[PDB]
Design an enzyme around this catalytic site. Structure first.
Site, PDB file in Angstrom:
ATOM      1  N   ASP A  68       0.842  -1.192   0.000  1.00 53.86           N
ATOM      2  CA  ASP A  68       0.000   0.000   0.000  1.00 53.86           C
ATOM      3  C   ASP A  68       0.880   1.247   0.000  1.00 53.86           C
ATOM      4  O   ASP A  68       1.344   1.699   1.059  1.00 53.86           O
ATOM      5  CB  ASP A  68      -0.907  -0.013   1.226  1.00 53.86           C
ATOM      6  CG  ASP A  68      -1.817   1.179   1.279  1.00 53.86           C
ATOM      7  OD1 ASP A  68      -1.896   1.928   0.272  1.00 53.86           O
ATOM      8  OD2 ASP A  68      -2.459   1.367   2.333  1.00 53.86           O
ATOM      9  N   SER A 107      -0.421  15.572 -12.168  1.00 57.84           N
ATOM     10  CA  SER A 107      -0.636  15.210 -13.559  1.00 57.84           C
ATOM     11  C   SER A 107      -0.884  16.456 -14.396  1.00 57.84           C
ATOM     12  O   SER A 107      -1.437  17.450 -13.927  1.00 57.84           O
ATOM     13  CB  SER A 107      -1.841  14.271 -13.652  1.00 57.84           C
ATOM     14  OG  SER A 107      -2.208  14.007 -14.994  1.00 57.84           O
TER      15      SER A 107
HETATM   16  O1  LIG Z   1      -8.426   7.539   0.733  1.00 60.32           O
HETATM   17  C1  LIG Z   1      -9.306   6.600   0.250  1.00 60.32           C
HETATM   18  C2  LIG Z   1     -10.521   7.001  -0.291  1.00 60.32           C
HETATM   19  C3  LIG Z   1     -11.382   6.034  -0.778  1.00 60.32           C
HETATM   20  C4  LIG Z   1     -11.041   4.686  -0.712  1.00 60.32           C
HETATM   21  C5  LIG Z   1      -9.824   4.304  -0.154  1.00 60.32           C
HETATM   22  C6  LIG Z   1      -9.385   2.873  -0.052  1.00 60.32           C
HETATM   23  N1  LIG Z   1      -7.982   2.737   0.322  1.00 60.32           N
HETATM   24  C7  LIG Z   1      -7.547   1.834   1.287  1.00 60.32           C
HETATM   25  C8  LIG Z   1      -8.443   1.078   2.082  1.00 60.32           C
HETATM   26  C9  LIG Z   1      -7.908   0.204   3.020  1.00 60.32           C
HETATM   27  C10 LIG Z   1      -6.516   0.082   3.162  1.00 60.32           C
HETATM   28  C11 LIG Z   1      -5.715   0.866   2.329  1.00 60.32           C
HETATM   29  N2  LIG Z   1      -6.191   1.731   1.420  1.00 60.32           N
HETATM   30  C12 LIG Z   1      -8.946   5.268   0.328  1.00 60.32           C
END
Ligand SMILES: Oc1cccc(CNc2ccccn2)c1
EC number: 3.4.23.22
Length: 330
Positions: free
Chosen positions: A35, A199
């Site tokens: 991530d 971008s």
């Molecule tokens: O800022 C965001 C806005 C919408 C959706 C998400 C999902 N992102 C994630 C969810 C769980 C663990 C790591 N990332 C993030």
């Protein structure tokens, strides 16, 4: 040193990607979600509330001869979709694709929210944003990349995500066979702790390119491409019958449609996302309404170049003293 690991979609929609990670001695292999939008390495564990574990592989620190409790340290994280997890902390040996870090903070979950419990394929997260976002208290901890950086041949990692197929995370080197053309590098701001860049614009299908600055983050941990409402409206206006549904929570489109491509600018270069990458399938089993892969960022506070965008490119996360991002077609 270098490392190289294959990353695999968890399902037929590419909702997320999992990469095997070796933790402890003897190794315990867990499949983690790498991530670039967060900075905690956390795992399902022998400490996780039993009712909140449903099929995941767990890390058991008591079975690792190299595990050590990081006394007094706790952690608690909430992500942008409302999911969360928390617990305590061990240090242990962690290896990814042959690259080993000793003394890595491994955050053991005592609690996870329902979305994590319900995803039996994801055993935890491995954060690759900047360590300033790490949630461990009272002593903030470093990411796996930050700990490995000095030992790497080059202070970089690359994400090469597949469309309906496995891909690769490499650490410490750039595989010049994995992309076409040249890599275009672009400036990064670390002020919010993310791989944040600007971008240079976009195009919809075969339409003309609109030069406009779009600030956003390169986030392998988010499935979709979240962009300003103006841009997203311009995209979905090209799909007959597409509409924003408040009940579903975003743009939906007739499953009978052929979607147009979406191009985003990186400096003077252009990355093309094929239309098929933007189809996330029926909103519910058997429905003829399909969920869109490009959605408005209006409620989030930041634009997110998630997997839909990143899997169309070979992406370099350059962690030199002045970090930069690189994008190439592939
Ligand atoms: O800022 C965001 C806005 C919408 C959706 C998400 C999902 N992102 C994630 C969810 C769980 C663990 C790591 N990332 C993030």
């Amino acid at each position: 040193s270098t490392g190289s690991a294959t990353t695999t979609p968890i399902d037929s929609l590419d909702d997320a990607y999992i990469t095997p990670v070796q933790i402890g001695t003897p190794a315990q292999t867990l499949n983690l979600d790498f991530d670039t939008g967060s900075s905690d390495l956390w795992v399902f564990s022998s400490e996780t509330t039993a009712s909140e574990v449903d099929g995941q592989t767990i890390y058991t620190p008591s079975k690792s001869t190299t595990a050590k409790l990081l006394s007094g340290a706790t952690w608690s994280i909430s992500y942008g979709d409302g999911s969360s997890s928390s617990g305590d902390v061990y240090t242990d040996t962690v290896s990814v694709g042959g690259l080993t870090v000793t003394g890595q903070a491994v955050e053991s979950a005592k609690k996870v929210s329902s979305s994590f419990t319900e995803d039996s394929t994801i055993d935890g997260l491995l954060g690759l944003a900047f360590s300033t976002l790490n949630t461990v208290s009272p002593t903030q901890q470093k990411t796996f990349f930050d700990n490995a950086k000095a030992s790497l041949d080059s202070p970089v990692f690359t994400a090469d995500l597949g469309y309906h197929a496995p891909g690769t995370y490499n650490f410490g080197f750039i595989d010049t066979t994995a992309y076409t053309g040249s890599i275009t590098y672009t400036a990064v701001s670390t002020k919010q702790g993310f791989w944040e860049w600007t971008s240079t614009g976009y195009a919809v299908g075969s339409g003309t390119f609109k030069s406009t600055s779009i600030d956003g983050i390169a986030d392998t941990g988010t499935t979709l491409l979240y962009l300003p409402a103006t841009v997203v409206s311009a995209y979905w206006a090209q799909v007959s019958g597409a509409k924003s549904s408040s009940s579903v929570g975003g743009y939906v489109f007739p499953c009978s449609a052929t979607l147009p491509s979406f191009t985003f600018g990186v400096g003077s270069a252009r990355i093309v996302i094929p239309g098929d990458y933007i189809d996330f399938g029926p909103i519910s089993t058997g429905s003829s309404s399909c969920f869109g892969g490009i959605q408005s960022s209006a409620g989030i506070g930041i634009n997110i170049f998630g997997d839909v965008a990143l899997k169309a490119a070979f992406v370099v996360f350059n962690g030199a003293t002045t970090p930069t991002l690189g994008f190439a077609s592939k």
